[PDB]
């Protein structure tokens, strides 16, 4: 038998395009964007955090019928001009990206002076709800790193504390935000086998940043982020099939 | 004995003899079980409006009657 039958194709119903591509959940999405119908013109902002395998993206989205509107956006590659030239996929990079997104959103809204966020790292503020996007929500996830970044930037994003590194460990959260967990990896790799160390953190050395410079570079990056955020139609098809038949009559 | 179980015969002309009456469609509807925390606030709004209007009218009446 064949399961790819003509009747099978006739009766097949396709998923949504985004579900087919695996981009969106479409259940989490509508639970995130659904607002009480009593509340007219209630925006219900969504803090979208995505992570490619090169850098992380944070944006502020509001759902509209014609399509989402993006009010702010920040990429980890923006950290080059803020002094983080390497490790743009890091927990610290995600925190910095969330901080940048929050600060730039508030600057666009002219609310920096009214919502200073926090200093260094340990009226009602803007409300946004975190969008994870297919990633599994394990404890110690860069999505929650970016959430903490935005929270420190001054946005009110509701969250628990079980998903920070350690089920609560504020010290571990601080060191992961500052990238200490990468510094310790650098130290242990260098101390155990230097060759693997230099083949792993190759661009770190090319950037001339060491295990002891990571924390300071992330601190000054945070402070400077804060202070300045072709087709072929039927005629050609017929001609081509005719010529293909003519060629085939002799070739095969 | 066996009886006629059911029929809708003559029911339509019975209905149309006095016409198919329509609902009265009053201007205002009771808000008894509707949207609390909204209609309570509306009560507060109306009280504030009435208080302002009444105090202004009382001021005018007192200043005109001396």
């Amino acid at each position: 038998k064949v399961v790819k039958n003509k009747a099978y194709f006739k009766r097949y119903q396709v998923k949504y395009r985004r579900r087919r591509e695996g981009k969106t959940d479409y259940r989490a999405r509508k639970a995130l964007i659904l607002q009480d119908k009593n509340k007219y013109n209630a925006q219900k902002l969504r803090f979208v955090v995505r992570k490619t395998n090169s850098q992380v993206i944070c944006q502020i989205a509001c759902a509209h019928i014609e399509g989402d509107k993006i009010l702010a956006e920040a990429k980890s590659k923006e950290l080059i001009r803020y002094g983080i030239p390497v490790g743009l996929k890091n927990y610290a990079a995600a925190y910095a990206t969330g901080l940048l997104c929050a600060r730039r959103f508030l600057k666009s809204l002219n609310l920096d002076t009214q919502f200073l966020g926090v200093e260094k790292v340990t009226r009602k503020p803007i409300k946004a709800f975190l969008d994870v996007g297919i990633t599994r929500t394990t404890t110690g996830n860069r999505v929650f790193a970016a959430l903490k970044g935005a929270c420190d930037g001054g946005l009110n994003i509701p969250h628990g504390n079980n998903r920070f590194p350690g089920s609560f460990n504020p010290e571990q959260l601080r060191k992961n935000i500052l990238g200490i967990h990468v510094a310790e990896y650098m130290k242990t790799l260098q101390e155990e086998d230097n060759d693997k160390y230099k083949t792993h953190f190759n661009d770190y050395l090319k950037n001339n940043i060491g295990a002891d410079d990571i924390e300071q570079m992330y601190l000054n990056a945070h402070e400077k982020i804060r202070q300045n955020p072709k087709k072929l139609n039927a005629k050609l098809r017929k001609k081509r099939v005719k010529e293909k038949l003519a060629l085939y009559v002799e070739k095969l | 004995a066996k009886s006629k179980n059911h029929t809708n015969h003559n029911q339509n002309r019975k209905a149309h003899k006095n016409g198919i009456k329509k609902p009265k469609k009053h201007k205002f509807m009771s808000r008894k079980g509707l949207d609390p925390n909204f209609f309570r606030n509306q009560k507060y709004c109306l009280k504030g409006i009435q208080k302002k209007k009444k105090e202004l009218k009382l001021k005018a009446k007192q200043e005109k009657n001396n």
């Binding site: 591509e21 695996g22 981009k23 297919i134 990633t135 599994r136 | -």
Partner: protein, 124 residues
């Protein structure tokens, strides 16, 4: 190119078909072969098996080397000793059919099929 056929997975299977004691012994010998833990089958509990990867899989396949028909049409193969060896081998990029985010299918050009499976076995 990165089209070389690697060993994606090697599975050792022990199907006793009864309760413990012998099942526990089978789990223990699977432990000795691979320090990683085994899992048991159905409990309608009848069999134990383990999944290995990488250098351990390669060396266990070499140990089990001690027939050019038992290759599957999907480019996998296996044999027996008592224990069943079954190796599922695939090219690079098999992640795209297993990860959650943008899960899709590889093309049949990228699939391994039986001819390349046999050639890979002969070469190795």
């Amino acid at each position: 190119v990165m089209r070389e056929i690697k060993v994606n997975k090697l599975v050792l299977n022990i199907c006793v078909g009864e309760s413990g004691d012998r099942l526990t012994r089978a789990a223990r010998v699977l432990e000795q072969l691979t320090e990683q833990k085994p899992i048991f089958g159905k409990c309608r509990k009848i069999s134990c098996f383990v999944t290995v990867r990488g250098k351990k899989a390669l060396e266990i396949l070499e140990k089990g080397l001690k027939r050019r028909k038992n290759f599957s049409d999907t480019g996998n193969f296996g044999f027996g000793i008592g224990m069943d060896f079954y190796v599922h081998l695939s090219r690079s990029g098999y992640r795209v059919t297993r990860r959650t985010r943008r899960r899709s299918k590889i093309s049949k050009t990228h699939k391994v099929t039986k001819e390349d499976a046999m050639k890979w076995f002969q070469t190795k």
